[PDB]
């Protein structure tokens, strides 16, 4: 199937004393593999997946060096943005950056991204062609001008199409035992009576990887979205994911309703019914 590598960075200013709280995390697909937390004792990029521990000291030195440079940039940004938006020193503010690449089933480059937000709102983002920028307002437009004159897009493109992909491949190989394994959802259905005339059917999927999944109901073979509730896909805590979808039905008509499950780890879509 398709794969991706993503890095997420959050910087939160600390008015009154010292530098921002800075937290960086790296993912391959839905598996976190590295982290840096400025509040932690080590001040190093740290492993969070076994297969990344295969990298030597030269890797850890370089990733620590880059990630600390990332944080210092965010630090300076928080002050610049304060100035751009005419804000005081009194409040805390947030900078977020996300970047990474997607590859298809052939592990060839599909798409790349690099986007940045201030206080939770779009600020500037590299467009799909990796050649120009989407700047949300006049502050971000000033930044676009800076980044154009420094050929930022050119550098990021080089990375997204080159390093990002080449290294995603390396990780997928090194971590194949789990990274290239799909875990099919483990499914079952529960029944609850709310009154004498109304029952709830809940269709569960558990223990699945990767996170992307589709759960739907049908009534007499027709799609049913009314009177259904679908929860946000959630982490189990052991690397796998969970989701359920429920439907409210007339008591005694349970047999009309079927739950349908699609997932990369299932060669055929799966059907469940209450009995």
């Amino acid at each position: 199937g398709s794969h991706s590598m993503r890095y997420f960075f959050t910087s939160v200013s600390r008015p009154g004393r010292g530098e921002p709280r800075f937290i960086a995390v790296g993912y391959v697909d839905d598996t976190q593999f590295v982290r840096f937390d400025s509040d932690a004792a080590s001040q190093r990029m740290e492993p969070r997946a076994p297969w990344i521990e295969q990298e030597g000291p030269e890797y850890w030195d370089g990733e620590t060096r880059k990630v600390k440079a990332h944080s210092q940039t965010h630090r300076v940004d928080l002050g610049t943005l304060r100035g751009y938006y005419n804000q005081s020193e009194a409040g805390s503010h947030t900078v977020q950056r996300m970047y990474g690449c997607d590859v298809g089933s052939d592990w060839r480059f599909l798409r790349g991204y690099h986007q940045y937000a201030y206080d939770g709102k779009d600020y500037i983002a590299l467009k799909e062609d990796l050649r120009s920028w989407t700047a949300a307002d006049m502050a971000a437009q000033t930044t676009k001008h800076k980044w154009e004159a420094a050929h930022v897009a050119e550098q990021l493109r080089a990375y997204l199409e080159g390093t990002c992909v080449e290294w995603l491949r390396r990780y997928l190989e090194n971590g194949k035992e789990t990274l290239q394994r799909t875990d099919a959802p483990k499914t079952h259905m529960t029944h609850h009576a709310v009154s004498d005339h109304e029952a709830t059917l809940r269709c569960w999927a558990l223990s699945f990887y990767p996170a992307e999944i589709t759960l739907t109901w049908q009534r007499d073979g027709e799609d049913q979205t009314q009177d259904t509730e679908l929860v946000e896909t959630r982490p189990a805590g052991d690397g796998t994911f969970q989701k359920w979808v429920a439907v409210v039905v007339p008591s005694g008509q349970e047999q009309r309703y079927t739950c349908h499950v699609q997932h990369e780890g299932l060669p055929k879509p799966l059907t469940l019914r209450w009995e």
Partner: peptide
């Protein structure tokens, strides 16, 4: 692997 060149101040 993190980006080496291209993380620039706003």
């Amino acid at each position: 692997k993190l980006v080496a060149l291209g993380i620039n101040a706003v």
